[PDB]
Amino acid sequence: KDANASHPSHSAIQSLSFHPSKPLLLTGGYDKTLRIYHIDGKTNHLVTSLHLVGSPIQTCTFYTSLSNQNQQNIFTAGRRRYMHSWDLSQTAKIEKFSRLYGHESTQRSFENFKVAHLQNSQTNSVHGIVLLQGNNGWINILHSTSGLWLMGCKIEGVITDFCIDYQPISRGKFRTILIAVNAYGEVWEFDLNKNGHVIRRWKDQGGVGITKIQVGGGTTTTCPALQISKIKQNRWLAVGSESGFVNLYDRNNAMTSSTPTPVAALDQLTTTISNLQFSPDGQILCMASRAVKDALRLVHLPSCSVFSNWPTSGTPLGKVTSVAFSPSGGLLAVGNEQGKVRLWKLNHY
Amino acid sequence: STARPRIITSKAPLLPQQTTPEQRYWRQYTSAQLVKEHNSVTHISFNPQHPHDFAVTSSTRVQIFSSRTRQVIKTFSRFKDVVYSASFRSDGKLLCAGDATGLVSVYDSYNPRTILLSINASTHPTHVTKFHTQDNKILATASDDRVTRLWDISNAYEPQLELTGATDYVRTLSFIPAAPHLVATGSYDGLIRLYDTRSSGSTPIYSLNHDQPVENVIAVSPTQIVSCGGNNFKVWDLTSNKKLYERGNFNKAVTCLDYVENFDSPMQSALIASSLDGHVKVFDPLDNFQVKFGWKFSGPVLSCAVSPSTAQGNRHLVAGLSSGLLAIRTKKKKSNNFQRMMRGSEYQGDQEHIIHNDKVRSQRRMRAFERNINQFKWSEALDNAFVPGMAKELTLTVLQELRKRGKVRVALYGRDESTLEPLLNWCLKGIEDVRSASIVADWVAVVLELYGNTLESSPVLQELMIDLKTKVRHEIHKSKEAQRIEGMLQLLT
Amino acid sequence: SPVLQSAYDPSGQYLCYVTVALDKQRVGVQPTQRWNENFLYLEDSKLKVTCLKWVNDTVAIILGMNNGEIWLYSVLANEVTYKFTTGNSYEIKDIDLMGNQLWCIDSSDAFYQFDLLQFKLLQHFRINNCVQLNKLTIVPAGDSVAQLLVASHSISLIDIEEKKVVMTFPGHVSPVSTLQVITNEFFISGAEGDRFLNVYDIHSGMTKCVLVAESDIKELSHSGQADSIAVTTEDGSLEIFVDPLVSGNKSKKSSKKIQIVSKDGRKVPIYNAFINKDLLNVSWLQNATMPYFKNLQWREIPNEYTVEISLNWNNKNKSADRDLHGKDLASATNYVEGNARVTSGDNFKHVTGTVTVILSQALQSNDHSLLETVLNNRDERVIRDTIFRLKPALAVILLERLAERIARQTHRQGPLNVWVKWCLIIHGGYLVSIPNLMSTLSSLHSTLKRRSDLLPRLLALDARLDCTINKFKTL
Amino acid sequence: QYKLSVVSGGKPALNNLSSVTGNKNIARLSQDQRNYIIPFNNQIKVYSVETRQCVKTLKFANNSLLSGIFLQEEENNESIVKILLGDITVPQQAHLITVFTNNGHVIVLNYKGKLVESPKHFKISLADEKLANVFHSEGNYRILTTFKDNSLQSYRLYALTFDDAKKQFEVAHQAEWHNVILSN
Amino acid sequence: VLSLSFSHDGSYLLSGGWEKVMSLWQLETNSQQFLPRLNGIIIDCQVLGPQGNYYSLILQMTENNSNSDYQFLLLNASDLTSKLSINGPLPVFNSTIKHIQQPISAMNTKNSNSITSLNHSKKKQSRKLIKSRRQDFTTNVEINPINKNLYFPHISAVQIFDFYKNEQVNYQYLTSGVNNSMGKVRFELNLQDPIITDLKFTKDGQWMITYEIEYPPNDLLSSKDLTHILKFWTKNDNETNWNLKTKVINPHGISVPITKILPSPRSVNNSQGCLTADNNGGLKFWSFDSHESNWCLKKISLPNFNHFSNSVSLAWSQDGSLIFHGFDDKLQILDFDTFKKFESLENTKTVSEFTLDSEIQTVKLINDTNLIVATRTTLNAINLLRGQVINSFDLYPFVNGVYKNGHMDRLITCDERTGNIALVINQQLTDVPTINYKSRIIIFDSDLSTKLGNFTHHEYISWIGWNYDTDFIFLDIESTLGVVGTXXXXXXXXXXXXXXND
RNA sequence: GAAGACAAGUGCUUGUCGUUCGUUAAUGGCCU
């Protein structure tokens, strides 16, 4: 049963994200609303429903801090200079990060952002950060509870997307890694634990008009960790395109040659890739296009075989704009443009 | 943290006769066009229902102007001799016209070719033909025959009632809103008659004396009528049977009057009156009929009327002169798939649980001087004060808020001779006012202890300094002689 | 509904509730008397809670299962202490408990007997001629647990010892939802999806009365000694009964009825209300899965009563640091003048070829284009004579129309200043006779005062000009 | 008939008798960052951080031990030097406040609850010189005071231990400096 | 630069200065981000959150030259909103009270101290409490008569405070100053803001009136005069901000102080009027018109005297009949209907002109009957029915020159239901007087028939009014306020705390 | 006014003083 049937939505669903420990879904789009749906098999009712005024909401993420496991902030932003941060009872606690402590001149908008953990390594204290995008190559890093501008990370070219590896070093210690993407297809590897230096560069084989990268097989921003020992290095890397091409990289072998051959070039879609998310176990690769209706395709891993039975023709999707997996139960939530978040269950899990 | 306060502009203690808020509404009427007619225009009345048209009498002609185009829509011309008054009914469909041959010829408006009903009234010339405000089928005309006849236009061949007793020349009658039976009828001898048409009617109930010949009579409230007669005009209270007010604030004899109520204005109820001087003054019954605003037209004004409250368009104040002129013044008044991908913008948070708005209101755009003082560019803020396209108020508000905030010298240390000449060319104008001369006294004296040494090298400043010597000594001579009266004035106190 | 299965402890201070959480049923206990983040997560996706029961020395609840075994949950730590495992694997449809003995229903119709003390299956046990069974409750004869009641659309009174069905009761068309022993004679049967409760008699084997709710009956509770029966209705309402066992007497309608309608106007569903003697407890779901409660005293309460709750349906957000608009609550508020009137204390109020008659004419009426035709005259012999043949009452009104033109036009007090003096010269004797000169000549006195205060400042500027001017001319 | 009393408090009692320290703030946020604790000149206030209001005041007029120390009228000399959050006595028992005075006195207080009118007082020995600053590491305590034999004040560094007895505190002389202008 | 503080990381540096701005230096790229204005200068910056969560900081409020006025401010690091600001109630005394030394800036002003001028002031400031007895340290305070908030005219502002909740509810600026437009820096610190000197309410409580004086900059041609600006303000009961309707530039002409103000009671014009007495002794009757939304002068009374009495006080008769006016050594009784002397056909020597022994400090009336007058030397009590004094009290030993003139008025108020309280102050010394004072509250009724109660406070007392809850309120040097007035249960306990490597 | 201390200049002179006794001007500016 649907995720929006108990309370429907108006604008095209833009971003979904489940809760890493709780049962929740966060639907929000251009409707200037946040809606939180508790999820069952039978009924999916509103927990609450926040309406911001004046800010379309293009990406939404829950964020449970790695230290406290009691903060549970909700970071949401759009095509504005600011970024609201709703905390988790009639009165809501909503902070807004209006100001960049260095410079507003690079980034004029916060329309794409990902929220990652980070370790200090002078102190063994873990806080979150907010990763942004910017003018031409700038990825800015705001401290997730203070709004302090930490570190600026430029790349050559034009950024289209980025994603965040995690490398565990020992027990209690790990370093996080940026993976920025030039539009032409050059992958940068910044590391955020020490101050931002390149680790390595490698061009994707081919890949001219590239939209999105997301890594997977371990802890990502969609299927994150709970304690520091849960943080695991990822294993699959997928690179979108504007011509359907997804390129899968085995992260064990591709970190050697620094111009690596991808494993299999997935080309089953016919349009611009817009959502690449993995299963939390790292066995399934969604790939979706916001251009043509009914365009979600699942890719099995490691066999790189697209599943053939689902989705059928009569599987109601719409123009898929926002895909999300559960962390725990194996559920699958797929947005649309109509507003209806239609929910599935991978019956293996 | 606090928001930045806007710099508050200097407001002097108020010189007398400020722009009162009723003088802001009645001065909106501009773009006065003057239409020549062939003879004196006698009565002007507006269509009540959709008020976009008003009839205007003339010599043998009733014209119909429009609201928005302000030109003649239709023209009634089938009359034999001069037609005096053209009212509309309260329905708005069907208008009257009383002639000099004594016939009132009532027919539908917007149709000048069908004289629907030609009431042969008295053989004396009928001046005033009006419709009843309450009952829409009873007409009442007057005549030069000194009898007013209430015509029921089911029967255009007999007057329903002959209403009489008048001594001399009834040339106005008007009905009263609370009573459909009661009729105010004004003779020319004085002596406003009040009739009950459900009675015998040949005698009045009670009369109202107007010591001079009363020319126009208009009911204003359900309890009050207004005698517009001779030099003054007087109001009257019916249940009191006694006058309440009198305003003899005119010069020559009145001609017309008009009352309108509950319209888009700071003044609720308006009472305008013609004075046969071109002089239409506007009065109000809420404020004890005090004078509020006045126009002056070229020749003497006979007929004047205003668009009603239900106008919902550009208003009109139409006044008609004796010399053939109408004078009108007015208060004027992508793709589909792209819109389906972004349709949330018009939602405005209706059925969600919590509404939260952080967005601060866009304030007024900060001026070029205020932007400089906020960013401490003081020497440039003073140079930004003397722009020719800038009000004389704001330049004073610079110099107070540059004197109050910093000292005046810091904006002045770097000034060369060429940057100094826009200052004094304002200061030569600045001391002549009383509103700035206590402040420009500071700004001149700080120059002279600063730049008197340069002033020997610059003969161009010296001519401004000799001109400043004269005008200040002139402003002595004002301030001396105006002091001389105040010491003199205390004898008479 | 989100709450699948809910049940109160005896004496009504807690309830367990069982809800789904991402295809894994969780159970959780809240308090009701005046949260609890702790929960028991069921590990498998497939095993589901089927019947639920408390225990009156840790406070434990008992979980009947889909699995074939009975979980036993202590509430203090989220741990399941021991498992009562039927060797066969069918779902357990009903669970029951009094004292050390436990009793449950296999979906293959098999009775079972467990000890809480001894932790042991007493008897695998089936009986004839009851082919489907889904609700079992034991009679409270005393310490003697014997002759227990089981039902599915028809009730059988069945002994333990002779292990046969003694009394056979007529029942419903639906399977029975609620089956509870009120008194040692009387007990309730209630069906699924029916508006009809029965009150039967154990010894007689008859129906005494029936009870009728206005919609379908979902959950049942009853007071101590058969005084009050509070029926949770599927529409969401508590149709209660007052003295149902006392003497049209065949069917008894509901005495008092309880709804909950929120403050915005929505109807809130009620599930599983508890009643004790003279104290009623409501529950409802405030958020999607959080239950809130309310104790209320119900014999005070009228026959129909809607508990009204403030829900933040359209509540605009009040940040405590934030003002009602825009700024902070600790920010200073600025001096904003705006539309102030600015007045001085000097501004008083509320305390022979001549041009005479034309000037006198434009003062009777107020006329401004006609005054300015007069004031172009500048010969002082005209200025002397025109004021002289003027009514003295008109001269006072003339001075007011002077100072208005003097104030609003600065250069104008050059030529007009002679035309103010002779007004004061000729009509000075009349001007003593008016009682309030300061009131009437206020605008005159205000304009002449503001010129008077510039006298020390302008004479100060004279010297500092003539410092320089006497200097730079010579050298 | 008539009575006099004291209703509203005054200053927030900043550390200006030091006038040497550039970190003058005495107030501390709690462990659970829900409430904020300021010693006024007349009382000690606990403001809730979310609801922005006072959730409890601790007047010195109520307790005899508080009024014997701070509400003394002949000497207004003693003042709150620094609040510490935890129990100095017992490891991690909650809702306790330990308060260090200007002259060697220690008061143990209770926010979030009714004030027990018998605090665990511990007058610090060797406080000839007046107490100026106290601070703590994890279970290790030091003391800064103002000592004097130029008109400048020399600072002496000490240390604290507990449970030799209850009232006793071993004071160790960690360091000393001869005269100080800005200790920070 | 007043205080610096690193974060817990060490990559950010807070600042603090006479400029009223917290600047957050990045040490990596040397940019900065800063809150512009924070209600006075900032003494000590402090970051408190272990994650870098809260900025907490101390404020001086340098507008007061007579008192350290500390506002503890705390912020969220994220939004930089003022969250849970805490501030004691802030009076303004007549002089620098007690040992308070203004913070250090670059150049010595009357708002700050230099380095070289630091110790030369502190040595001098002790002598003003040793050489002189002239020190008063008095505070003008007015009580809101419908909301019982306690407004303090902190200079060019009002701290709206209430003592029941013990909390500041507002801080409104009341003058076109230079206040939030700019933090004053070292040459600009000589420019002091305009000073609210009088602040009264009408008995309605819907109107608040404001008298202030704007000052010129020094070294200008017009640095000699002083604009006396009067302001008449409104608010509803619902709103806590005030709104201005009539600003008045220069009552009684230019450069004339209007130092004493009494509002009108409900009897005369529903308490919508105020009176202003000059140093010359002129009386104007400002009041509120109805058809206009604004104030005018209904009645004036302007004498021109050869001398200037800077000590005036006046009292109103509760019927609305007549106005008591006090000039130096001399009372006046004015018929309100004429603004002239009370001319009597009786000629029973009930003269409007009285002749007192010393300059009047207060004029107070208990009822229509009594009238209590404090001169510079003495206190007297004169009935209205017979014009003969009842009780004499020589306040000459307690008050010789202890007060600048006029400031006695704020100490002595009259509860209209019970009676009077005067407020007598001693300094006490052993063996040069000490810094410590001692104030005694004495209760009076029916033009000082009896002493109802002598209350001896151990510190100083600077102001008394009587709250309309039949009680007197007083300040103190330490800004304190005082009132002179008449199995399952064990299963419940364990679930209370429990719910809330390999 | 004095003492104290320090610096410069060539024992002396000038200068300063986070001291005491006594009298009443570092290119440095206000967020989003």
PDB file of N, CA, C and O in Angstrom, chain E residues 71-91:
ATOM      1  N   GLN E  71      25.076  42.095  30.355  1.00  0.00           N
ATOM      2  CA  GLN E  71      24.056  41.277  29.716  1.00  0.00           C
ATOM      3  C   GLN E  71      24.719  40.003  29.222  1.00  0.00           C
ATOM      4  O   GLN E  71      25.467  40.031  28.242  1.00  0.00           O
ATOM      5  N   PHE E  72      24.451  38.887  29.892  1.00  0.00           N
ATOM      6  CA  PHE E  72      24.991  37.612  29.442  1.00  0.00           C
ATOM      7  C   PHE E  72      24.185  37.137  28.246  1.00  0.00           C
ATOM      8  O   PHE E  72      22.973  36.933  28.350  1.00  0.00           O
ATOM      9  N   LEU E  73      24.854  36.952  27.120  1.00  0.00           N
ATOM     10  CA  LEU E  73      24.207  36.591  25.873  1.00  0.00           C
ATOM     11  C   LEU E  73      24.729  35.242  25.416  1.00  0.00           C
ATOM     12  O   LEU E  73      25.924  34.960  25.538  1.00  0.00           O
ATOM     13  N   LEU E  74      23.833  34.409  24.903  1.00  0.00           N
ATOM     14  CA  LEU E  74      24.185  33.096  24.387  1.00  0.00           C
ATOM     15  C   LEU E  74      23.578  32.945  23.001  1.00  0.00           C
ATOM     16  O   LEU E  74      22.509  33.487  22.719  1.00  0.00           O
ATOM     17  N   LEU E  75      24.265  32.220  22.124  1.00  0.00           N
ATOM     18  CA  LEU E  75      23.776  32.058  20.764  1.00  0.00           C
ATOM     19  C   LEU E  75      23.905  30.625  20.289  1.00  0.00           C
ATOM     20  O   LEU E  75      24.754  29.868  20.761  1.00  0.00           O
ATOM     21  N   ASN E  76      23.056  30.271  19.333  1.00  0.00           N
ATOM     22  CA  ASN E  76      23.314  29.106  18.506  1.00  0.00           C
ATOM     23  C   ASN E  76      24.440  29.442  17.547  1.00  0.00           C
ATOM     24  O   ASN E  76      24.477  30.543  16.994  1.00  0.00           O
ATOM     25  N   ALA E  77      25.367  28.506  17.352  1.00  0.00           N
ATOM     26  CA  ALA E  77      26.416  28.728  16.365  1.00  0.00           C
ATOM     27  C   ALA E  77      25.860  28.695  14.960  1.00  0.00           C
ATOM     28  O   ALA E  77      26.383  29.367  14.067  1.00  0.00           O
ATOM     29  N   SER E  78      24.806  27.915  14.758  1.00  0.00           N
ATOM     30  CA  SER E  78      24.298  27.654  13.423  1.00  0.00           C
ATOM     31  C   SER E  78      23.604  28.876  12.847  1.00  0.00           C
ATOM     32  O   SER E  78      24.055  29.457  11.854  1.00  0.00           O
ATOM     33  N   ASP E  79      22.524  29.297  13.480  1.00  0.00           N
ATOM     34  CA  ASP E  79      21.692  30.367  12.961  1.00  0.00           C
ATOM     35  C   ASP E  79      22.210  31.739  13.348  1.00  0.00           C
ATOM     36  O   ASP E  79      21.871  32.723  12.684  1.00  0.00           O
ATOM     37  N   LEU E  80      23.057  31.796  14.378  1.00  0.00           N
ATOM     38  CA  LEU E  80      23.441  33.024  15.074  1.00  0.00           C
ATOM     39  C   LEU E  80      22.226  33.836  15.490  1.00  0.00           C
ATOM     40  O   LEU E  80      22.127  35.032  15.226  1.00  0.00           O
ATOM     41  N   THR E  81      21.289  33.182  16.148  1.00  0.00           N
ATOM     42  CA  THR E  81      20.212  33.892  16.802  1.00  0.00           C
ATOM     43  C   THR E  81      20.508  33.979  18.285  1.00  0.00           C
ATOM     44  O   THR E  81      21.102  33.073  18.872  1.00  0.00           O
ATOM     45  N   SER E  82      20.097  35.087  18.877  1.00  0.00           N
ATOM     46  CA  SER E  82      20.190  35.258  20.315  1.00  0.00           C
ATOM     47  C   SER E  82      19.245  34.277  20.981  1.00  0.00           C
ATOM     48  O   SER E  82      18.024  34.441  20.923  1.00  0.00           O
ATOM     49  N   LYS E  83      19.801  33.242  21.585  1.00  0.00           N
ATOM     50  CA  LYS E  83      19.020  32.238  22.280  1.00  0.00           C
ATOM     51  C   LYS E  83      19.336  32.338  23.759  1.00  0.00           C
ATOM     52  O   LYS E  83      20.483  32.112  24.160  1.00  0.00           O
ATOM     53  N   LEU E  84      18.317  32.676  24.551  1.00  0.00           N
ATOM     54  CA  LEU E  84      18.374  32.732  26.011  1.00  0.00           C
ATOM     55  C   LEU E  84      19.406  33.768  26.476  1.00  0.00           C
ATOM     56  O   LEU E  84      20.452  33.459  27.038  1.00  0.00           O
ATOM     57  N   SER E  85      19.086  35.024  26.167  1.00  0.00           N
ATOM     58  CA  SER E  85      19.835  36.170  26.665  1.00  0.00           C
ATOM     59  C   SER E  85      19.380  36.487  28.075  1.00  0.00           C
ATOM     60  O   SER E  85      18.182  36.464  28.363  1.00  0.00           O
ATOM     61  N   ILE E  86      20.329  36.803  28.946  1.00  0.00           N
ATOM     62  CA  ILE E  86      20.055  37.009  30.359  1.00  0.00           C
ATOM     63  C   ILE E  86      20.678  38.320  30.787  1.00  0.00           C
ATOM     64  O   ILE E  86      21.866  38.556  30.549  1.00  0.00           O
ATOM     65  N   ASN E  87      19.877  39.164  31.418  1.00  0.00           N
ATOM     66  CA  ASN E  87      20.279  40.519  31.730  1.00  0.00           C
ATOM     67  C   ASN E  87      19.610  40.950  33.017  1.00  0.00           C
ATOM     68  O   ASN E  87      18.394  40.817  33.167  1.00  0.00           O
ATOM     69  N   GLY E  88      20.403  41.476  33.935  1.00  0.00           N
ATOM     70  CA  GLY E  88      19.865  42.069  35.128  1.00  0.00           C
ATOM     71  C   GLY E  88      19.200  43.385  34.797  1.00  0.00           C
ATOM     72  O   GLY E  88      19.426  43.957  33.730  1.00  0.00           O
ATOM     73  N   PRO E  89      18.351  43.882  35.695  1.00  0.00           N
ATOM     74  CA  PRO E  89      17.660  45.146  35.434  1.00  0.00           C
ATOM     75  C   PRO E  89      18.645  46.299  35.528  1.00  0.00           C
ATOM     76  O   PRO E  89      19.512  46.315  36.400  1.00  0.00           O
ATOM     77  N   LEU E  90      18.544  47.236  34.589  1.00  0.00           N
ATOM     78  CA  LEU E  90      19.578  48.255  34.414  1.00  0.00           C
ATOM     79  C   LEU E  90      19.028  49.638  34.700  1.00  0.00           C
ATOM     80  O   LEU E  90      18.334  50.221  33.851  1.00  0.00           O
ATOM     81  N   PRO E  91      19.309  50.207  35.855  1.00  0.00           N
ATOM     82  CA  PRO E  91      19.012  51.617  36.093  1.00  0.00           C
ATOM     83  C   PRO E  91      20.094  52.488  35.469  1.00  0.00           C
ATOM     84  O   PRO E  91      20.959  52.025  34.734  1.00  0.00           O
TER      85      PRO E  91
END
